Amino acid sequence: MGVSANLFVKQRGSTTALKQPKEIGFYSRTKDEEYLISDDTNLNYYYLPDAELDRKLDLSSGFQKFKDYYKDFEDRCSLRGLLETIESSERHKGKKINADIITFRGIARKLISCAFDSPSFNTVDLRIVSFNGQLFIKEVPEAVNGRNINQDLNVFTGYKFETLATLSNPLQYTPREVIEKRTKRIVSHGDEYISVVRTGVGNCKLILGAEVDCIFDFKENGRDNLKHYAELKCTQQVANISDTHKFERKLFRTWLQCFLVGIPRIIYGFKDDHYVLKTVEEFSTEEVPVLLKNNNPQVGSACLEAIKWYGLLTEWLLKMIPRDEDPHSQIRAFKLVFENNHLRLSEIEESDEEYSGLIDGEHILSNGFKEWRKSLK
């Protein structure tokens, strides 16, 4: 009886713009999975002078003492801090946020890039959905419980560059010894600052949680800081014409990541073989579509195709008939989403399934205190 539907991944819509991103709030996540709503202890500040690029800074240094906390988390992809942040913005104004879909920027990017990247290259994942009066979308974790250590070292390299280029407090409030210790400092992952952004495409209104690296120039208290953030990005050599094309495909995915949530600056480090930081370069998020149209037309073309697909995708998430029954005490429904063989597939999770009793009755998708917030109107 219930919903089953498929969307063809190379079909595209008509939307070519996003509603201007605005910051609802923020939270920081501790290494202990505690969520600190309206708290910014994990927001870093950028600092890396041009003179530092003359020094042969090594991005492999300290790999053996890496604190990867994120592996040990009980619910790696949990919505809890996003929902708990939304509730705090609703409590002081007495009404729901008018939005249709609540999700992470990472899930929005993983969807949109299906239009271009095949399931293996994309690293396709299960996505899982429910309604309450709006759609809530969650990623299913990787199930893990250029090869082996040489892939883990290329992952670590990104977290070390983000640790070398930043400070935990403003430069003006940081003592000189903390700047000198910075090359010896332990690198860690799963200790984020997450901004909560309101946005939209066509007629769809969206709330995206977005993990941000640092603030580039300055912080304004009690205001949208969205124009002050930057993304610092993972690093590679460029020494030949075909290296420019390998870079341009990474720069497109990086523009897509910033554009969805209004981050205006992208900063790239570059490496030799081995792990010496060779150079740094910086891009405004507005340059990238023009820069790609000039240097590589068939990649620069994808910037419009991505948004024409993002609108089609989000309209068909609402038009593939999940119930949007508004009364927050009416019975819920619950669905899978996949990408498989140029189709995206969606199916209800009927009450016989092991998931169905737990996403409907229990903690696995929406927090009990959030269900009480909204059922108390």
Binding site: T16, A17, L18, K19, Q20, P21, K22, N98, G200, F259, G262, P289, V290, K293, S301, C303, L304, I307
Partner: peptide, 13 residues
């Protein structure tokens, strides 16, 4: 093709 992605003004609520 001169068209490129841009933002639009929100609903003001």
């Amino acid at each position: 093709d001169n068209i490129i992605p841009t933002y639009e003004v929100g609903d003001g609520d």
